[PDB]
């Protein structure tokens, strides 16, 4: 068989990031994690644009617009939705993931899903640079991989 | 990295609001909350158009049409769906959130999701100007932010 | 602010109705409820077209086609899905609500969601002209409102 | 009001059927049920084309393509998804129902949802020609109705 | 009635495969299973292109692009999402299944859903070449069937 991959060399890549202000206590650590990860992989700090939106529901809207400028190789979406007392959590999470997916689809640009969806604050901290690592770092790496792999497609 | 934000200066913005009549006991307080929030942020009362629809299922329909007039910088959707004895709640909430999201998508205009979805009346009052604040106020602020941030995109 | 509403004057309106045969014991009472409601609001009986389909899954298909004829001001969908032993209920309800919503979306014509989704026969009778009123009547009224409000949009 | 129906006269109709091989122990009885039902309603055996696909996930794909040939008055989808140990069941059922619905939508041809989704083998047998009747027969009848009703629409 | 099938002769077919790196402990066995299955069915190893993506959320993106090249008769998606402590599982699985389905839809090329979604590692191993067989092998076979069946459609 013939293998098609994407290496982790970020040199020369232009990355766009959309972060939600909601739960910034967490998302900010996600953002910084992604930044460091990108830099240590060869991406130039100036080649990184970060756009802040109120909540995760907004993330798709910004992600699509940024991707449409065709100015980026990949887009990283960073958010943190923590469940509450109502089903609000459900809609925010669904629409976010739904839109983040269709953004990449209609845009052709890889849009990495980095929205942390937990039951409580602990699980959030758990995935923002603790026990489970930093989802932001994992997303940065995936962004790089997808950008490189995307060269192999047109 | 390069940051892209949206400040909270509402001066000069034109806002459209779609409110559901259903559970108006709550939604009306959401509406007034949004209005006051907008005014105190610099938005002119005359630059605010409010459209009433039966229920939340209708909100998407009106939100899309209002956004399509391209007459608004952002659109705020206000509603309150309180769970009952059947799964009706589920469809109304899903379709509302689904449509409110696609309205902004297909329209390019930010459409703020301000539909309160609770298990009971108490949680509704809780989020319409009590313990948890007023979702209407939060949406007004988000509308302003998104409108301003949207300038940075084309 | 500037208010945009829809009054309950049905005079001159042309209404289309799609009813599911499934659970007709209930849906028929929903239909007659809507009819009477429409008439008593000024709609002429001859300005009302009713189309019957097997079940609620079919409702969206007929609703979209009727709306596309642009012959109607609003479309009322009437159905009753009562939960059973399997998850069948789920798909029928979701697809119905999903399609009824997109019908109005793609058609520009208001399509009122009048599908009663209950756990048992009692809750169905409850919402078809008993304790909880008649969802058909509520839909007729919403249809009229949406039709009138729709004049304010193009 | 003016009633629009669909009678159960299958004479002259051309029906397409898509059956999943998965759980054929059940689906085959669904298929034969639909066949007999169609024949006894006036449909000519030669006017019936049956296409087999691996599982229910594939059904939408085949149903849309068959409908697109515009060679059929209605399309019957027959499948049986029985829940297992994982959530696999969920995705297969959702995508199936989602696609079978959009097939009719985008195609204009009625596509009858005849996918049996149960918790166990017993409920499957229950709906494939036992206690609860034969969903295949019910779908055949619905297919005929929808085909005839569809004449009333363009 | 007239039957339309797809035989299991892979000779001459060109297959594309998208595998997620996430849970590669399992997915790799899925991939090898698919490969062997394809070869033993007549597919030439050189007629098989494999593309690796970070996780299942990425699978749809790659599957659509590969399908769009119109260079393949069918596309096999291979992944393994194992549930964790949060609802993350839900979004990854839904979006994956959602996208893998729409890829085939919009592309016209069959895209086989081979994403293993389990509650634990054991059920994963169970479906990757143990008690329940190898989902990769089952997908390979389905890919071949769908490719052949697809000849019958335009
Ligand atoms: O990013 C998040 N947005 C949230 N807000 C929802 C949404 O993203 C918007 O802020 C607002 O709903 C209007 O669009 C959240 N909660 O409400 O809990 C959350 O946890 N995380
Ligand atoms: O906005 C709401 N709409 C509701 N009605 C449903 C829907 O919004 C429409 O009014 C009507 O269904 C026709 O589409 C609600 N309930 O039914 O409970 C509710 O709580 N909130
Ligand atoms: O309108 C309904 N249709 C139902 N049938 C589902 C569907 O509407 C179609 O009749 C058939 O599925 C083929 O399209 C129902 N149940 O099955 O329970 C139900 O409760 N209500
Ligand atoms: O028709 C069915 N297909 C099933 N397979 C899923 C799918 O239809 C495809 O065969 C395969 O997933 C690759 O597309 C089923 N299960 O897995 O249980 C089932 O119960 N019924
Ligand atoms: O294929 C998988 N991807 C997973 N990652 C999610 C997603 O596929 C992407 O890798 C990343 O979310 C950014 O798009 C998984 N988990 O997170 O558990 C998993 O179990 N399986």
Short mmCIF file of C-alpha atoms in Angstrom, two decimals, chain B:
data_model
loop_
_atom_site.label_atom_id
_atom_site.label_comp_id
_atom_site.label_asym_id
_atom_site.label_seq_id
_atom_site.Cartn_x
_atom_site.Cartn_y
_atom_site.Cartn_z
CA UNK B 1 1.10 35.95 18.12
CA UNK B 2 -1.40 38.50 16.76
CA UNK B 3 -4.60 39.09 18.69
CA UNK B 4 -7.96 39.87 17.12
CA UNK B 5 -10.67 41.01 19.56
CA UNK B 6 -13.93 42.86 19.78
CA UNK B 7 -14.36 45.68 22.30
CA UNK B 8 -17.58 46.45 24.15
CA UNK B 9 -18.32 49.82 22.54
CA UNK B 10 -21.83 49.65 21.16
CA UNK B 11 -21.87 53.15 19.71
CA UNK B 12 -23.05 53.17 16.12
CA UNK B 13 -24.13 49.53 16.09
CA UNK B 14 -27.48 48.41 14.72
CA UNK B 15 -28.94 45.44 16.61
CA UNK B 16 -31.79 43.12 15.74
CA UNK B 17 -33.53 41.02 18.40
CA UNK B 18 -35.88 38.03 18.03
CA UNK B 19 -37.87 37.08 21.15
CA UNK B 20 -40.25 34.19 21.69
CA UNK B 21 -43.69 34.91 23.15
CA UNK B 22 -43.71 31.47 24.74
CA UNK B 23 -42.75 31.80 28.42
CA UNK B 24 -42.79 35.59 28.01
CA UNK B 25 -42.93 35.79 31.81
CA UNK B 26 -39.22 35.06 31.48
CA UNK B 27 -38.32 36.15 27.93
CA UNK B 28 -39.65 39.66 28.48
CA UNK B 29 -37.15 40.10 31.34
CA UNK B 30 -34.51 38.74 28.99
CA UNK B 31 -35.50 41.32 26.40
CA UNK B 32 -35.48 44.26 28.79
CA UNK B 33 -32.15 43.06 30.12
CA UNK B 34 -30.67 43.05 26.64
CA UNK B 35 -32.13 46.47 25.85
CA UNK B 36 -30.70 48.13 28.94
CA UNK B 37 -27.38 46.38 28.40
CA UNK B 38 -27.21 47.62 24.82
CA UNK B 39 -28.14 51.20 25.71
CA UNK B 40 -25.65 51.44 28.55
CA UNK B 41 -23.01 50.25 26.12
CA UNK B 42 -23.66 53.05 23.64
CA UNK B 43 -26.27 51.57 21.33
CA UNK B 44 -29.05 53.96 20.35
CA UNK B 45 -32.50 52.74 21.29
CA UNK B 46 -33.69 53.54 17.77
CA UNK B 47 -30.97 51.37 16.27
CA UNK B 48 -32.65 48.36 17.94
CA UNK B 49 -35.38 46.37 16.18
CA UNK B 50 -37.27 43.70 18.09
CA UNK B 51 -39.32 40.99 16.38
CA UNK B 52 -41.68 38.72 18.33
CA UNK B 53 -42.42 35.14 17.25
CA UNK B 54 -44.68 32.48 18.85
CA UNK B 55 -42.03 30.08 20.15
CA UNK B 56 -38.34 29.22 19.98
CA UNK B 57 -38.92 26.99 16.98
CA UNK B 58 -39.81 30.20 15.10
CA UNK B 59 -36.79 32.15 16.33
CA UNK B 60 -34.41 30.77 13.65
CA UNK B 61 -36.83 31.69 10.86
CA UNK B 62 -37.10 35.31 12.00
CA UNK B 63 -33.42 35.60 12.92
CA UNK B 64 -32.33 34.53 9.44
CA UNK B 65 -34.70 36.90 7.67
CA UNK B 66 -33.67 39.83 9.83
CA UNK B 67 -29.99 39.05 9.32
CA UNK B 68 -30.54 38.77 5.57
CA UNK B 69 -31.71 42.37 5.36
CA UNK B 70 -28.03 43.11 6.10
CA UNK B 71 -29.48 45.99 8.11
CA UNK B 72 -27.91 44.72 11.36
CA UNK B 73 -24.42 44.32 12.83
CA UNK B 74 -25.52 41.46 15.05
CA UNK B 75 -28.71 39.66 16.00
CA UNK B 76 -29.74 38.60 19.47
CA UNK B 77 -32.10 35.63 19.86
CA UNK B 78 -34.02 35.49 23.13
CA UNK B 79 -36.13 32.59 24.28
CA UNK B 80 -37.05 30.29 27.12
CA UNK B 81 -37.83 26.63 26.67
CA UNK B 82 -38.70 24.90 29.92
CA UNK B 83 -38.85 21.12 29.90
CA UNK B 84 -42.22 19.42 30.20
CA UNK B 85 -43.56 15.88 30.33
CA UNK B 86 -42.64 14.89 26.77
CA UNK B 87 -39.56 15.09 24.55
CA UNK B 88 -41.09 18.13 22.81
CA UNK B 89 -38.52 20.20 24.73
CA UNK B 90 -35.73 18.36 22.92
CA UNK B 91 -36.86 19.14 19.39
CA UNK B 92 -37.68 22.76 20.11
CA UNK B 93 -34.30 23.34 21.73
CA UNK B 94 -32.34 21.45 19.09
CA UNK B 95 -34.01 23.03 16.09
CA UNK B 96 -33.75 26.48 17.69
CA UNK B 97 -30.05 26.16 18.47
CA UNK B 98 -29.46 24.43 15.10
CA UNK B 99 -31.20 27.20 13.17
CA UNK B 100 -29.83 30.10 15.16
CA UNK B 101 -26.39 28.78 14.38
CA UNK B 102 -26.97 28.25 10.67
CA UNK B 103 -28.60 31.68 10.39
CA UNK B 104 -25.32 33.36 11.34
CA UNK B 105 -23.45 30.90 9.16
CA UNK B 106 -25.36 31.46 5.94
CA UNK B 107 -25.87 35.15 6.66
CA UNK B 108 -22.36 36.16 7.74
CA UNK B 109 -23.98 38.28 10.45
CA UNK B 110 -23.30 37.26 14.07
CA UNK B 111 -26.39 35.68 15.63
CA UNK B 112 -26.13 35.41 19.41
CA UNK B 113 -27.68 32.32 21.04
CA UNK B 114 -29.71 33.59 23.96
CA UNK B 115 -32.19 30.81 24.43
CA UNK B 116 -32.59 29.75 28.04
CA UNK B 117 -33.24 26.02 28.25
CA UNK B 118 -34.11 24.84 31.74
CA UNK B 119 -35.64 21.92 33.62
CA UNK B 120 -38.00 24.13 35.59
CA UNK B 121 -39.32 27.64 36.12
CA UNK B 122 -36.84 28.25 38.94
CA UNK B 123 -33.78 27.75 36.76
CA UNK B 124 -35.40 30.04 34.22
CA UNK B 125 -35.90 32.86 36.73
CA UNK B 126 -32.39 32.05 37.93
CA UNK B 127 -30.99 33.04 34.51
CA UNK B 128 -33.34 35.90 33.68
CA UNK B 129 -32.09 38.40 36.21
CA UNK B 130 -31.42 36.60 39.49
CA UNK B 131 -28.77 34.28 40.90
CA UNK B 132 -27.14 33.52 37.56
CA UNK B 133 -27.50 37.01 36.12
CA UNK B 134 -29.57 37.83 33.05
CA UNK B 135 -28.81 35.82 29.94
CA UNK B 136 -30.27 38.72 27.96
CA UNK B 137 -27.61 41.06 29.28
CA UNK B 138 -24.92 38.52 28.54
CA UNK B 139 -26.20 38.17 25.00
CA UNK B 140 -26.33 41.91 24.43
CA UNK B 141 -22.69 42.17 25.44
CA UNK B 142 -21.78 39.20 23.21
CA UNK B 143 -23.71 40.78 20.33
CA UNK B 144 -21.68 43.94 20.66
CA UNK B 145 -18.40 42.01 20.90
CA UNK B 146 -19.20 39.88 17.85
CA UNK B 147 -20.28 42.92 15.85
CA UNK B 148 -17.00 44.69 16.54
CA UNK B 149 -14.92 41.56 16.00
CA UNK B 150 -16.78 41.05 12.74
CA UNK B 151 -15.31 44.23 11.34
CA UNK B 152 -11.94 42.50 11.41
CA UNK B 153 -13.36 39.97 8.94
CA UNK B 154 -13.92 41.54 5.55
#
